[PDB]
């Protein structure tokens, strides 16, 4: 009679449960611009001399 | 372009 020679081995040994990470994009470290205060040429406002 | 408006007649002023 065949003792069924057991060899079987289960075959669940699916490691990765999940994937691995993805990269994904830095945000945007804005140049902070503030300052309107441009020229004008000081020049003593526009007199038509 | 800082120090760039002068366009009619910016420091000008002959009075």
Same mark, same amino acid.
């Given at each position: 009679?065949?003792?069924?020679?057991?060899?079987?081995?289960?075959?669940? %040994?699916?490691?990765?449960?999940? %994937?691995?990470?993805?990269?994904?994009?830095?945000?945007?470290?804005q140049?902070?611009?503030?300052?309107?205060?441009?020229?004008?040429?000081?020049?003593?406002?526009?007199?038509?001399? | 372009?800082?120090?760039?408006?002068?366009?009619?007649?910016?420091?000008?002023?002959?009075g």
């Amino acid at each position: 009679g065949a003792p069924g020679a057991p060899g079987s081995q289960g075959a669940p %040994g699916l490691q990765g449960a999940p %994937g691995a990470p993805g990269s994904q994009g830095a945000p945007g470290l804005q140049g902070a611009p503030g300052a309107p205060g441009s020229q004008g040429a000081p020049g003593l406002q526009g007199a038509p001399g | 372009a800082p120090g760039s408006q002068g366009a009619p007649g910016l420091q000008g002023a002959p009075g």
